Amino acid sequence: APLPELLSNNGKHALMVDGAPYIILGSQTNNSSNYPDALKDVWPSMEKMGANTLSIPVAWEQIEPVEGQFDFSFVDVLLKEARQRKVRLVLLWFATWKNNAPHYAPAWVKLDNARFPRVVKEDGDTLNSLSPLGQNTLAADKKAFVELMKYLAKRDKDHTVIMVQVQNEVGTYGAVRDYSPMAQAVFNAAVPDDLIQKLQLKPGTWSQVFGRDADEFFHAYQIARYCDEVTVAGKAIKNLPMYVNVALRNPFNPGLPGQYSSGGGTDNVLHIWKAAAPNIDLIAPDIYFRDYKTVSKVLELYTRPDNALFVAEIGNDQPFARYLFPTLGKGGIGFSPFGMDDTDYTNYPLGAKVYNDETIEQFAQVYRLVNPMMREWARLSYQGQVWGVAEPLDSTTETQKIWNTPEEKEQHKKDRASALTQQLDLGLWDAEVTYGRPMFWVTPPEGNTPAAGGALIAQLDDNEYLVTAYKARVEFKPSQELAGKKFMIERVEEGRFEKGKWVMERVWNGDQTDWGLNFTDRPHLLRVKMASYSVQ
Amino acid sequence: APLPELLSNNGKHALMVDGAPYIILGSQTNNSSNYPDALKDVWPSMEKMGANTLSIPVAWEQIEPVEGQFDFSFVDVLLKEARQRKVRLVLLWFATWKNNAPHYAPAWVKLDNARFPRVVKEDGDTLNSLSPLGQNTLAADKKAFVELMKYLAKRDKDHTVIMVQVQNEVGTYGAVRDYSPMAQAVFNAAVPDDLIQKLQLKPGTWSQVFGRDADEFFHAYQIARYCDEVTVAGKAIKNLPMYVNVALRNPFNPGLPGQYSSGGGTDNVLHIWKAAAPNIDLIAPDIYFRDYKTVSKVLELYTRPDNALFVAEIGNDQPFARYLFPTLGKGGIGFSPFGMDDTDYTNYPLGAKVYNDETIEQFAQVYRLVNPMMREWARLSYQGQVWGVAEPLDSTTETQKIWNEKEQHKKDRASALTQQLDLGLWDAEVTYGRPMFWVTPPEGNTPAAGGALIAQLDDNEYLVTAYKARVEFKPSQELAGKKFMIERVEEGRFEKGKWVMERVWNGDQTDWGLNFTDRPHLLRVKMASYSVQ
Ligand SMILES: *[C@H]1[C@H](N)[C@H](CO)[C@H](O)[C@H](O)[C@H]1O
Ligand SMILES: *[C@H]1[C@H](N)[C@H](CO)[C@H](O)[C@H](O)[C@H]1O
Ligand code: NA
Ligand code: NA
Ligand code: NA
Ligand code: NA
Ligand code: NA
Ligand code: NA
Ligand code: NA
Ligand code: NA
Ligand code: NA
């Protein structure tokens, strides 16, 4: 089997696994699940969820508890047990930074500030965040990362591990950058020529070149460099795809760096990160916003010709499940809900209040739409045209229920039906996606309670589309005036792929096609052929 | 075994299956279940329902996907699976019209308007409704139908398939008829003498003869002839019973043709359909009206000396189940609730919001009354006297609920929930929603659900079975000094056509009428007048 690789071409992207595009329909563990004993509490969720890929930490403290004394006993067991369950892995390298901090570095690292120095604030106080300009730190992290990758080269010939995250949520809370004498010496010095030439700027010192942004861009540049060097070193051993995951700032109202995690790949510093760390394959958003407007904005910012979309973290509460659809519609390579294990921890108010089969089942339901076509979908998304949408109104609040005049009620229902109707330009044909209405007749949509639906569409040919959707109606129509022809559905087939060949189960027709294509919680994969026809 | 056939004599009808009267206690699939892979989501509901007959589509598009290249692979599987389950079939031929439209016709038909022309409106816009004046369409439909019937003649010698529906809900929405120059040439022309003579009318052109009804009567005639032609051709091959099913207009407030599906067998054109299509066995209503008054009206209009009642489609929501009773009461040959499969579709608000075991059980409960006596009831319906009633108030509304003098409303609902049946020398009074003891007035079941069947066995003897109701017997006429009583009530079953007694109802079980809950009981009730001289 060939190595996994992130391919990029013509504004589009694919995670290759075993020589073809692949989608990560993932589960991520809680942060303390990276031990042999905890795996029994991980696997049952993954099976209930139907995930193909587990994201799980491998901690520097665990593999190198004493300096030079390595321990891959966790990695051994994890590999074997993944293989028994025929799932893949994304290993998360928790090392110099895990959520800005060194807690997962071995004690001989995190307790020796002299050797492995922290970020100093402008006021001279010290933050528990390791400086990207500590050369011993970089050397030490590199060396352990290399041993991990050596373990993979020796013991993972079939690439059970498909990708590695290098650090977890890098940056600094509480200051913009390192203000140490060591850091200040670099800040006062000329900006590296490499960055100047890539950005096509005038040479000068950090403050001369970037002004108001010098402190934050400096920290991003130094962090990116460090992560790049770590990545290069590991990939020299085994050239897996590697990525970084971002503690996002609010894209509409970020506040100041240091309120958010300064130096990470936030939307304002993506240009710095891409310039500085050409060996990092992509920069992944960690999504804990619940509201459709903010989530959608994040997906837009992180989907770039130079950046494959991977939702490396998202909340595991019900509202988050539907963001699978726009993720996949943007050509994303994967989606990884956080905290999908039974190790007795919930990060509520971020994720679900109660972790039970119902929590898992919200994701299982959407995953069951994609799993039966995963490779086909993956191919279409890289090489062709795909689309995807989620229900665009969040669930009605109690504040909103309380204020629910007879003419006012009517106007609001109208407003909401319009908001809950989405248009997709599919070339010669459009789709109209609507949420929360009967399977029969044309009563306006009123939304699902809770908000939950979505759809996937892939273009097979000029008049032919793959469609599957969830608690929604999909209706097709011409994209342009027909100049006197009529149109109809030629044929809608429900079916599946077997050995990459379409197998028809049944034809949808009559009531099933009179009123759009109506989907509940169950999985149906459709091929939809449209026709215009003359009546002259 | 002998061919199934519809008999009609002396104002009565029967569907003969295997040489004796038969009642269709049916189930009908949703519209996209006519494939091998879907049948696993059909059979379990049928079994939970206790249905004896499955109505399922056979689509023109599936049997002739490319012109002249026939494919009966579905019919094959369907026949074998039905026989394994020991049930019968009604095939629904979805061809030139399914609900006005050609969607089930093959691509080479529905995408070729030059060859197979659509209805043209008065303003020259075109509707997706195939014109009955399209002679290429009629020939093509006929040829494929003939091929289906050929398949049955060769491959169904035991008549698993007992009846065939020709098209599904014919007619046109959006226009009264085709106004294409081709159609206009016929409309301007003489009305066919055969129709003139059957209707005892003066000869003349369509507008001359029918005036304000010309447009609709023209479309009704032209669709009737088309359908009769397909029927005749298929019966030449194998003479099964064949019928058409009607997208009803509201009998009390129809609106205009084209608002409703113009040219179907609606109650105002039954006379045209009967004169134009003498080879179609019956015209069957499709019933989605929920309300007792309207359903009752529909049942009244479609049960005629020339028309056997078959409720070819009805909704599967709970209020519909009790309409089995008046359907059978009227001499109905069957009843076919729509949407009885697990293929993840509901037509709510027409049928049930949620399709589950509870949905099915509402029908299974009423079918359980009739299955144990199906052949005996079928016989008594054709060759004798039967009656059937449903609870005649619909479930109280939320705003009648938040309405509510109270003693007067209760007195009115009581009178309303009391039905009289004239059984010759004896009458029956059927009441709904009261205890099994004493005489407190009826208050209705919640939701509305009761009914009753009765068949006369001799002057003084009746077969009775009912559901969430009380049945009381009394003399029909004054007894001129005699008293009366129940002589004997026997609960039992038929075994090999013989009545087998289980027990005698008496004492409490007969002091207060004959009280039925949700469980099945079949009673033989013998009444007597007696002298006290
Ligand atoms: C993403 C996120 N902050 C969760 C919070 O529960 C967790 O800390 C993950 O490790 C982060 O990467
Ligand atoms: C009767 C009715 N219109 C239902 C609606 O779900 C369905 O279209 C059947 O095919 C019709 O015959
Ligand atoms: Na277009
Ligand atoms: Na367009
Ligand atoms: Na399927
Ligand atoms: Na065309
Ligand atoms: Na009869
Ligand atoms: Na009488
Ligand atoms: Na009388
Ligand atoms: Na009994
Ligand atoms: Na007597």
Automatic annotation (TrEMBL), chain A:
<keyword id="KW-0378">Hydrolase</keyword>
<dbReference type="InterPro" id="IPR017853">
    <property type="entry name" value="GH"/>
</dbReference>
<dbReference type="Pfam" id="PF18120">
    <property type="entry name" value="DUF5597"/>
</dbReference>
<dbReference type="GO" id="GO:0005975">
    <property type="term" value="P:carbohydrate metabolic process"/>
</dbReference>
<dbReference type="InterPro" id="IPR013529">
    <property type="entry name" value="Glyco_hydro_42_N"/>
</dbReference>
<protein>
    <submittedName>
        <fullName>Beta-galactosidase, putative, bgl35A</fullName>
        <ecNumber>3.2.1.23</ecNumber>
    </submittedName>
</protein>
<dbReference type="GO" id="GO:0009341">
    <property type="term" value="C:beta-galactosidase complex"/>
</dbReference>
<dbReference type="Pfam" id="PF02449">
    <property type="entry name" value="Glyco_hydro_42"/>
</dbReference>
<feature type="domain" description="Glycoside hydrolase family 42 N-terminal">
    <location>
        <begin position="41"/>
        <end position="191"/>
    </location>
</feature>
<keyword id="KW-0732">Signal</keyword>
<keyword id="KW-0326">Glycosidase</keyword>
<dbReference type="InterPro" id="IPR040719">
    <property type="entry name" value="DUF5597"/>
</dbReference>
<feature type="domain" description="DUF5597">
    <location>
        <begin position="363"/>
        <end position="519"/>
    </location>
</feature>
<dbReference type="GO" id="GO:0004565">
    <property type="term" value="F:beta-galactosidase activity"/>
</dbReference>
